[PDB]
Amino acid sequence: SRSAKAGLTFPVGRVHRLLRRGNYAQRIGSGAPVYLTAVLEYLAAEILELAGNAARDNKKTRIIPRHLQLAIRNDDELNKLLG
Amino acid sequence: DSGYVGGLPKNVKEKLLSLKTLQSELFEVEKEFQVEMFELENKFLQKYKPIWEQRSRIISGQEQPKPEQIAKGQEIVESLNETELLVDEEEKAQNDSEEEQVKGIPSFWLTALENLPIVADTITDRDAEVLEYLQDIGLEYLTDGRPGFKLLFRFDSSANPFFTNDILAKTYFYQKELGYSGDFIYDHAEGAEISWKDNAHNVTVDLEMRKQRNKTTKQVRTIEKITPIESFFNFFDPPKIQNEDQDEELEEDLEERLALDYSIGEQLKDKLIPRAVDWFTGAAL
Amino acid sequence: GYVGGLPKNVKEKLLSLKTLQSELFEVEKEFQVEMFELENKFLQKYKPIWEQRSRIISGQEQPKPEQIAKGQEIVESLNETELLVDEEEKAQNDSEEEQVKGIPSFWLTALENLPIVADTITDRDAEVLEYLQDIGLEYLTDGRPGFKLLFRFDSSANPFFTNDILAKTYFYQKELGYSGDFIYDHAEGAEISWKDNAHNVTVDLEMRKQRNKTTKQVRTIEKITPIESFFNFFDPPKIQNEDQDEELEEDLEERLALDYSIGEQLKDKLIPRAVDWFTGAAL
Amino acid sequence: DINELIIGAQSADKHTREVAETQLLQWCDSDASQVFKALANVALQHEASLESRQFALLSLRKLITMYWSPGFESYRSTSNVEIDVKDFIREVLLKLCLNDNENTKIKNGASYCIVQISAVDFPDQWPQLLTVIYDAISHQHSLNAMSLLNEIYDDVVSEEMFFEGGIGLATMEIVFKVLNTETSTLIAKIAALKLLKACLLQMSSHNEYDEASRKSFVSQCLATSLQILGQLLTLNFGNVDVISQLKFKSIIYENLVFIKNDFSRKHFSSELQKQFKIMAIQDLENVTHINANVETTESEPLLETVHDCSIYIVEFLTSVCTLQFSVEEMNKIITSLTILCQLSSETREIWTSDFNTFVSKETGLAASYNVRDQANEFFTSLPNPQLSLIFKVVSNDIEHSTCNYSTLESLLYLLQCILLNDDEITGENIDQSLQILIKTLENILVSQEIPELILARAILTIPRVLDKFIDALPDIKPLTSAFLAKSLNLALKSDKELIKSATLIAFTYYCYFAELDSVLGPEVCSETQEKVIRIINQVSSDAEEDTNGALMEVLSQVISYNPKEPHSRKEILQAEFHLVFTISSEDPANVQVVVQSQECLEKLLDNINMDNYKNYIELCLPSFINVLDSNNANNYRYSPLLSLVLEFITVFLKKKPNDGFLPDEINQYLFEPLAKVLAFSTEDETLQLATEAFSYLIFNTDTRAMEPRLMDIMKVLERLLSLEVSDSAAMNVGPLVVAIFTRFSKEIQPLIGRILEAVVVRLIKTQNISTEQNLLSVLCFLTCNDPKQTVDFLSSFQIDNTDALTLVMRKWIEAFEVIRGEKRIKENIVALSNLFFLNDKRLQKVVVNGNLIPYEGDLIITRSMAKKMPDRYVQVPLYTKIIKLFVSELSFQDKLKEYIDDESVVQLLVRFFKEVASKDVSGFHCIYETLSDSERKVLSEALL
Amino acid sequence: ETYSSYIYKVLKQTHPDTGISQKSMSILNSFVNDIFERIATEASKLAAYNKKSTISAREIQTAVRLILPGELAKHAVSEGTRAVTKYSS
Amino acid sequence: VPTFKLVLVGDGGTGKTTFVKRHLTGEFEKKYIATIGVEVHPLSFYTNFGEIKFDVWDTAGLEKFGGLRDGYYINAQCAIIMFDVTSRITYKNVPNWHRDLVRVCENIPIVLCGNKVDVKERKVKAKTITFHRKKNLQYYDISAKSNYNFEKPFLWLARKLAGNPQLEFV
Ligand SMILES: Nc1nc2c(ncn2[C@@H]2O[C@H](COP(=O)(O)OP(=O)(O)OP(=O)(O)O)[C@@H](O)[C@H]2O)c(=O)[nH]1
Ligand SMILES: [Mg+2]
């Protein structure tokens, strides 16, 4: 798949379709979605990492939304990005 | 166990031969069963056709809901969970003149296809451009001629700028004999040659054109290049076999392409159209 | 979401679509009725062949030279040259051949070659199933839909239980399961009337003769403890869901999944294809 | 053990308080039941100090949420709280709440806990609660039980459990029974009426379409409540406990207005409206006569309570004001109101002592709301047939009271409230009454005996009389002129600031209902302006609160009447500017004064002409420079008047640049203080305003006059790029550097290194994106000017003793991946062309690390993960990366050279590649070898 | 919207021991889509400013740099470039 | 010297901590750090008639940090309810804060302060400000940056507590 070719897990196709639905430009570069897919998979990686960190801060393996919130607390730049 | 099989007495061996014969007779009975199921499925397709036709008219906006059907839809909404359809006070203040500015369902079949798991992954944005003009998807069972089912995609020539064909169709064929499990087994498929308005509007190839005062051949010549590309409309024109190339190259071709083609066709015919409304809204997932 | 947010033309059209969908559902119910009629009709044709092969396997009926030969062409075309007769086998006398009437452990071998059900068979189960004479299938017509399975044992010579025929029933839910098929609902089966606990292969036996240390009475004890076996196919999970069975319902759901997989395997492969699975060619 | 915890947790000292709180939470986590029971015991014992008992109940209310039941959103686990202890606490809390022996603080704490427990338990898990409450109310008329039930209604009862649950019918039955019992004490009836208010509040969220089970219940309850209230209003209680009688009347009328407003017209019939109207008028009259008993001073709250009750009675009369009123009941209403709307001796003394409070109340900005406001609401609301009759009544009563100095002020206020109603007062004899009214008002003006406040009210109410009746008065113009002149003369002669401010506000009303210039004539209008500015001068010396805002509004009105230029008078413009400046700078933080000075100042500069621009310059500019110097002494700390000053400095500079350059007077005045502001200041808003002003000044001042201060604009550029200012301030540089390049196009070249050093040092330090392109656009712009001079600085300039090219080329071309915008991007292409065509060996070979070489593995490298697998890059030379970026945007928009030889980004950059191929083949081929095939093609096909 | 399985994969790759609730995936996905939409809107702003009107790698790097804080943005850009390079190879 | 406990109370984020900090040191504070628990800051004012002293209990306005919050109101003699003119939710929170103050200490004098008036973007105005007119508690519009009405709440409270309407600060 294109995601595997890009070295990404998250869907390049869904990113491209979400980009399409906004009609953000008259023609689309194949680099735009792949790049963005990687950016958002990076945000997922960072958020998740802090989320697991918080979960273990809660002495456990299972994350729930409170623990995502404390993950956002643990990293101020996500705090200002997500509010 | 070959040792055991050799160990079986002769008498048990003709017994097993007769049992194999009984299995074969059951195979012919399965063939008749499949014939009867195909005939009755075609009959029920004929039974189905008007309701698909009516919902297609609704999808295209050619027909307007009548308040009995509106009320029946409302009471179905009250069942399970479809409260999205309950009309609010704000919309009742609207007028048909404002609402009918957009006629039909925008990108109904596009979203219905792109909600289908296996098929959606093949639809590029260039393909999706044509699917915007898709307004109907019909099924036809090849009762006449070789057995199979044919998929129909409909368009408006006066609307779409890509091709002059109002209807694009894809065909699947089965072999004359049933499979080992008793289900139908497939034969090579065929697809229609789309009458593209121009090669620029073609979606299944990439072109390059260039002019050279070619010093090598003393030719002031123009060169055009055409290269097939991956696209959903490659679903049509399926591969065919040439014996010498079939043995080496097209063996892997039939191993890969035919499986995906048949799976996509089966998914469409079974999952999609009977629940096209639910696939459109995603409730069929 | 935004489809709802669109003006009321969109809601009314999709309400009409839902009305038409209910109409599709009614027509599809009638389609299911017509099909179930059709599989019942062709199951009436299926049954004679299964009974004939079962009688052949049990030895109550003998083949015919035409059947033998036409099986010969069939085998030659299949390339399964293992079944071919050899002159050494032909040398066997009629007395040697007639020492066994039926095929020894035919159904046992077929189930052993069967992928999952083979795992359930134990040594005592293998011994017992030699007394199995037929596997039959039936459709449930009255009331709620379902299908039934049946097994036949020669209870006269069977030293394990007196049950001449054991039947297993499978069930579907009342309305149309989504995607146009039926989804499972709970199954029921019979109880095996074991001749004794020693021959009860669903139970391991302990024999104790004791003089009670407290009351100083004299007693002889026969003790029972259930064990897994191919006949755990019978005594299926009790009910789909009930207030008192939840703790049981966990294992009931697990065993329901396993038992429906087993029954679907039976219905699709073994009853329609028994000879190849016995010979292992179906592998 | 619990005792020292509750003592320590009360301590002001942070350490003891924090440690006690933490020990308490730890102990409650270990065994919740022990701590809960200990707290309940402390709350129960009378031996403990009441502070300890309050602390126990409040802390227990907190601890319940986290350790009582998982139905709470909070639920701190390990909550061992058995049904045993929960029942003990449920018992103890009722025993505290319902005991009359307990202090109201303990009752309130206990009810506060019962309300929390009810949140998760009320209708299903604690059924004894309502049984005990209803028993106490119904059989003992317990006030505590009614208060507790009222709190329950406030905080935990809900619509579904009110209507479909049992709560509503049971409560309404209990309430009606308590009100119907003659033996029930009056205070119990008051409590039951409050509880009735709560029930009505629940019932109000209803609709005509709803369930009949709700609808019929609502209808029947409203009918019974109206019957009971009508019956209650007939009771009388004599002299005993008049305060409670007033509170009883007050709550009855509050319920009646609630029923009148919040429910359908069918639930409160018109005939019942008439009956309650009669009873309301009679209750108003009665409440007035207790106000004569007020003179006994039997209890101080008596006057307060009389006014509070009358507020609700007048509010009910407002709600039913569409009903017809007979003449005698209008007389009763008017008499009662003249007694009620009378100013107290306290308010009279306050207004006489400090006119600022009078001004604040009169202008409508005072916070207080009282019976005079409700009378304003009543008269403002009357329809025409009622209003025309009430006006005759009040005007007639003014005539007969002219001899009294007690009721005349109230009567004038009542007339004022009548005249603010929007309808037209028309009738058979309003001509005659109106003539008498204007005559008596004129006599109030003439008389010397009149006390201050009657005179002030008359001054304020004549504008209203003229405005309302402007069509009925046949000679409105001379009347208006004479009244205005007389009022102004009195204000000038008077030594009371109160009458002066009253006259100023009345002037505002004349400016409201008439164009003064047309009605007075130009000379009289000019003399009026002179008088008004004189009075403002006299009043302004003692303005406080909203008086500055009011003075600024009246000054705005004065300014709007200034004559046109061919007859404009210099000194009145000077006076207007002096007043706006002085009033504003006297209260610089008052935002309303600042904004109104904004409108006033823009009006003054609206008559601006190039024919009189010098005069305005010389008039304004010294004062603004004084402001700048006075803020300089205060270190330019935020003062929003300084903000407005700077804004109008900018716009003043933008008004008349019709000459190619603004007059050098503006430069001479502004440049030194304005640079003194860009230097020696440290705040975002002040520097933002000062830099836009200074940039606009540079944008239109003469280069020849500005050359002497060119080093100063250098200091501005450097200190604005210096890290003394925030990056927020730094981003503003764009306009100013563009301006200097416009106005020093040729003179800037010798100093560009001083430009370059500041721009680069901020560049490498900043991580703010939008900042660095702005600096990089400049650095692009420098090389578009001359890349040779730019680089000589770049090569010579250093940070951390390393050549700036090693710093700039990498960071600039790294950011060239995010530089965006066609012109800006064109500036880059021109910049790179200037570089590439300079072609010194540095440009040919400096490594700009242009190519990524990703770290291995498809896992996504987090910031933390980058600490052990950082991404890696390839040190390609400058030309390699830049051309890749070039051809890339060409994509988004020597054998080749042989075939090439046979205004917009694409046109702009293609010649560069043509020019490159025309001037450096070897580099072009060298770069070609580093170029990718897809880029090679695009480069080829674009050139072709 | 659903990125559930890919969220699982990223979680294991970053924390093999860790579990995650469906509601947590929904919230994370909401964050993902909101950040996608803001980045894409800024990219469209760029594509509108310049007649080029084509969105590729560049405008996205710009939008990520403008929107994300510096330390998030640097490695987000790093991963974007990594994926683009891996795709292009 | 008469000293009074003043509990400064009000929604989180609204300006309580910087207001006290400026009265204490005179310098504004741009950034937001949520207070946890309470800080007690002893203020002082020099007046005519002598001296006024306050201990200001600056409470955490965030419920996640309002640990044992009502227990701080026990011996309060006066209070300030602070809301923010630019965020209407903080104003709608006002009646609840007032009720919580009353429940613990019934009849102390209360003053209501609308902070951050020094921005053009104010979302609630004096017209909507009506909770005072009913409960009869003083109301002022203040700001901590520009020091508009900077000392009036304390002046009004000191006049009310000392019972001396001629009191004024110097
Ligand atoms: N412009 C302006 N900002 C102000 C003003 N008063 C406070 N601020 C800002 O608002 C914030 C003050 O909130 P804090 O005092 O920290 O918060 P709080 O209201 O005590 O609430 P918690 O800390 O949550 O208990 C700071 O960021 C100040 O810069 C003002 O009058 N004007
Ligand atoms: Mg704070």
Author numbering:
A (entry chain B): 17 to 99
B (entry chain F): 81 to 365
C (entry chain E): 83 to 365
D (entry chain A): 2 to 894, 934 to 942, 963 to 1004
E (entry chain C): 38 to 126
F (entry chain D): 10 to 179
Give the exact sentences the study uses for this entry:
The importin Kap114 transports H2A-H2B into the yeast nucleus, where RanGTP facilitates histone release. H2A and H2B contain disordered N- and C-terminal tails and central alpha helices that fold together into the globular H2A-H2B histone-fold domain, with very basic surfaces that bind DNA in the nucleosome. The mode of H2A-H2B recognition by Kap114/IMP9 is well understood: the superhelical Kap114 wraps around the H2A-H2B histone-fold domain, occluding the histone’s DNA-binding surfaces and functioning as a histone chaperone. Here, biochemical and structural analyses show that Kap114, H2A-H2B, and a Nap1 dimer (Nap12) associate in the absence and presence of RanGTP to form equimolar complexes.
We assembled the quaternary Kap114/Nap12/H2A-H2B/RanGTP complex and solved the cryo-EM structure to 2.9 Å resolution. The final cryo-EM map of the Kap114/Nap12/H2A-H2B/RanGTP complex is well-defined for Kap114 and RanGTP but the local resolution and map feature for Nap12 and H2A-H2B are poor. We named the quaternary assembly the Nap12•H2A-H2B•Kap114•RanGTP complex. In this assembly, RanGTP binds to the N-terminal HEAT repeats of Kap114 while the H2A-H2B domain is sequestered by Nap1 and the C-terminal HEAT repeats of Kap114. In the quaternary Nap12•H2A-H2B•Kap114•RanGTP complex, RanGTP binds to HEAT repeats h1–4, 8, and 12–14 of Kap114 in the same way as in the RanGTP•Kap114•H2A-H2B structure. Comparison of the ternary and quaternary complexes shows that Ran-binding stabilizes a Kap114 conformation with an N-terminus closer to the bound H2A-H2B, but not as close as in the RanGTP•Kap114•H2A-H2B structure where Nap12 is absent. The nuclear/quaternary Nap12•H2A-H2B•Kap114•RanGTP complex buries ∼1,900 Å2 of the H2A-H2B surface. Within this complex, Nap12 and Kap114 collectively shield the DNA binding interfaces of H2A-H2B, mirroring the arrangement observed in the cytosolic/ternary Nap12•H2A-H2B•Kap114 structure. However, Nap12 binding H2A-H2B alongside Kap114 in the nuclear/quaternary Nap12•H2A-H2B•Kap114•RanGTP complex shields the histone from aberrant aggregation with DNA while Nap12 and RanGTP work together to facilitate specific release of the histone from Kap114 to the tetrasome.
